[PDB]
Symmetry: C4
Subunit: 645 residues, 4 copies
């Protein structure tokens, strides 16, 4: 403690006197910290919040500043611990509320996935987001981010050149084999031990490991697919396909690599169920619960047959574990209170479930209460079946799970035929986002491209009928002479010939057909050919190239618009850069300290996870207003600096 030289002589002697020194000159630093740090942390945080409030609300006070200067030593400890939100409390009053931000929350906020999600949310709310629902979208994004952060926290050289290129990857193959051996043999003595406690605590750990490493094994599967497809470049025909292109050591490694790829694909499809299924289930439950509470979907506004989501979300509202992932349970009671007198007192509860359960609870509120017993190997009756089946239906409807199912199916078929592994190269497009900047230039228009090819087909069809009617003696692609075939004698044959030859010929259709020297048709067929060239492969491929090029510019313009809006406006109050740019570095300080989106998200987390009973006045106000989902507590066009001097 004296080598650090943070503590002076007085402090060191004080702590040495405060030591236990219980007749052994030995102290338990664990219990010492446990008794002398946590209450100190709590009271110090409260004092820091009080001093920060006094400083921010009592400016230009030298008497307060002199105290703050000596108080700075402890005030800096809680600097990355206290948030600050500017809300609208009393009528026309921008109140600055303070709260605590947990280290776990701040750690999970800086994860790259969360940052990318926030960037995408900002992008697609600036571009196509509205104004009446900006705070709606922001609160939805905040709720999803809080749920996912909690989930994450709770967890001869033409042939030999390629041979030489792959021979350098044995150094990676051997370490992959060592990694899989440390699991199949080094972990076997633990995974095959010899009860329920020690098996559940292990299966939960394994599921958490898969959820943690879901993406890393996606990369691993991609690399294994590349290796398989590279070693597939050594095949020869003899009706029989043979891999005889090296000095052995490839025929068995291909099979073991295919087996490894299938195993990794299965582990990916089971890790997705642990990582991303809870998030989509949370979103679905939140959506259906809010529809029930604020719209009376299955009460007054029965969903139509157009949407399957509404129909499939009908057999979930009547189960007991309905809000399994919504961090609240007072939704059935809320809707019962809202529609219990306007509609059937029992007719609401019969289709919301727990009707007999409500009657039993009312009866048991009297002097009638037994003790429930728990029996091992007898939880199949305890677990819900209807809710699980609804969840399975939602999962199998989910698109991202279907992609992994198709991936697994192709991997399985790769064993039957050792070429379906080529279909796994499509994961670089349908999967990772490293090629999105290029594939977006094609998929941005999309409909325009297919409309262009349809127009091309129609124009070629018109030219085809014109050729069929007026040009007989020209479509005479005969080989060696006196063997006329592949002619214009059939209408569909001519259409196929046009679409397949004239479009790709590069020089129209006149470069693949006889010389137009026959009388009375020279100029007519010259016009025909030159117009084909100028209309089909001059201003119809130029249209496709123009669509592709314009997609790049449109995406760049969208990105520039997002950057412009986020640099010259505030996301929450939307006042403007110029007003805040009067104090040196004003706008950046306003967007980093006063109106921080991360701070607002942390405040929402604090309200949700703190409690219901000991909210302060501002916390209770904001909580009630968030529960009723109206949101004028978000500063609309005002801030603290506009409110005061």
């Amino acid at each position: 403690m004296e080598s650090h030289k943070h503590y002076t002589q007085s402090e060191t002697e004080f702590l040495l006197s405060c030591a236990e020194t219980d007749e052994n000159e030995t102290l338990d630093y664990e219990e010492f910290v446990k008794r002398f740090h946590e209450p100190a942390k709590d009271i110090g945080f409260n004092v820091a919040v009080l001093l920060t409030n006094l400083s921010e609300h009592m400016p230009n006070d030298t008497r307060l500043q002199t105290f703050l200067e000596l108080a700075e030593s402890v005030l800096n400890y809680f600097q990355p611990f206290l948030g600050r939100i500017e809300i609208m409390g009393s009528a026309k009053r921008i109140e600055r509320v303070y709260f605590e931000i947990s280290e776990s929350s701040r750690t999970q906020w800086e994860k790259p996935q969360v940052k990318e999600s926030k960037r995408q949310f900002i992008f697609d709310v600036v571009n196509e987001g509205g104004e009446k629902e900006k705070m709606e979208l922001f609160v939805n994004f905040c709720e999803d981010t809080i749920f996912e952060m909690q989930l994450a926290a709770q967890i001869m050289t033409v042939k030999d050149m390629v041979l030489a290129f792959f021979s350098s990857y044995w150094s990676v193959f051997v370490t992959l084999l060592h990694f899989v051996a440390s699991v199949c043999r080094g972990f076997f003595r633990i995974v095959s031990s010899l009860f329920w406690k020690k098996i559940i605590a292990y299966q939960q750990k394994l599921l958490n490991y898969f959820a943690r490493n879901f993406y890393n094994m996606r990369m691993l599967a991609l690399f294994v697919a590349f290796a398989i497809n590279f070693i597939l470049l050594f095949y020869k025909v003899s009706v029989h396909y043979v891999l005889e292109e090296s000095s052995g050591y490839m025929e068995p490694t291909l099979r073991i690599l295919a087996i490894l790829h299938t195993i990794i694909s299965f582990f990916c499809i089971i890790g997705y169920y642990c990582l991303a299924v809870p998030l989509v289930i949370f979103k679905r439950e939140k959506e259906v619960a809010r529809k029930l509470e604020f719209d009376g979907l299955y009460i007054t506004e029965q969903p139509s047959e157009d949407d399957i989501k509404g129909q499939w979300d009908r057999l979930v509202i009547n189960t007991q574990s309905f809000p399994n992932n919504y961090w609240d349970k007072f939704v059935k009671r809320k809707v019962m209170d809202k529609y219990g007198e306007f509609y059937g007192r029992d007719r609401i509860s019969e289709l919301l479930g727990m009707d007999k359960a409500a009657l039993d609870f009312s009866d048991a509120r009297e002097k009638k209460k037994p003790k429930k017993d728990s029996s091992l190997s007898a939880v199949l009756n305890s677990i819900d079946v209807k809710y699980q089946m609804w969840k399975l239906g939602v999962v199998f409807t989910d698109n991202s799970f279907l992609y992994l199912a198709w991936y697994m199916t192709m991997s399985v078929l790769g064993h039957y035929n050792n070429f379906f592994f080529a279909a796994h190269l499509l994961d670089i497009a349908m999967g990772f986002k490293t090629l999105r900047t290029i594939l977006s230039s094609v998929t941005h228009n999309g409909k325009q491209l297919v409309l262009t090819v349809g127009l091309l087909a129609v124009v070629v069809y018109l030219y085809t009928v014109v050729a069929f009617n007026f040009f007989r003696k020209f479509y005479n692609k005969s080989e060696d002479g006196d063997t006329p075939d592949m002619k214009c004698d059939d209408m569909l044959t001519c259409y196929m010939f046009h679409m397949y030859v004239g479009v790709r010929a590069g020089g129209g259709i006149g470069d693949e057909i006889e010389d137009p020297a026959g009388d009375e048709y020279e100029i007519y067929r010259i016009i025909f050919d030159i117009t084909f060239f100028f209309f089909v492969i001059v201003i119809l491929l130029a249209i496709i190239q123009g669509l592709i090029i314009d997609a790049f510019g449109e995406l760049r313009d969208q990105q520039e618009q997002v950057k412009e809006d986020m640099e010259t406006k505030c996301f929450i109050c939307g006042i403007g850069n110029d007003y805040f740019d009067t104090v040196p570095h004003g706008f950046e300080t306003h967007t980093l300290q006063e109106h921080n989106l991360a701070n607002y998200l942390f405040f929402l987390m604090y309200l949700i996870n703190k409690d219901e009973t000991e909210h302060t006045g501002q916390e209770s106000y904001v909580w009630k207003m968030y529960q009723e989902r109206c949101w004028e507590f978000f500063p609309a066009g005002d801030c603290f600096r506009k409110q005061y001097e």
Copy 2:
């Protein structure tokens, strides 16, 4: 070093013409249109390689009697019988052919494969040298803007 080697072989002085690019800034306005994206261009060529590889395996599995570039007749060679040979043939001929890959291979008149190989060829043309060179040209053009 190149100047010194030019004395040993009087042709390494051709490597000094690269100083107009790596040196003086008179050509920066033009070379920036290529080097501004850069990573996008190599990603595009990688995607082109992957698409041509997929088409190569499809051709290897389903089109045997077509890759028959025999000269003077009865001398079959340069075929699709080898997977890497077919991939090399595709990358080296179909990409640069200007008319897809159907303009360098036999006429698809064989029964039960006419429409299938027509679809194969037209899709090669429309995906590889229509909207994949257009992507490269669009990157080059967008760099200017």
Copy 3:
């Protein structure tokens, strides 16, 4: 239109197959792919 390999003998001679393939494909990709695209891009950018 197809580089320089479409006007010259087939690169089947030993010890030069891959080298001349690289030569031809690089000619195609550098001279008539991103060097005529530069001219077309200049023409198009002038309009804008």
Copy 4:
């Protein structure tokens, strides 16, 4: 050019009023001011 025309139309209709042409900034002092002005006070449908 067509994309620029569409963007210009959207820009004008989002930062100006069709009738009085005052501007977005003046009305954006009351919460949701410009939208209320363009939906209730100076509605083209209302004038028709």
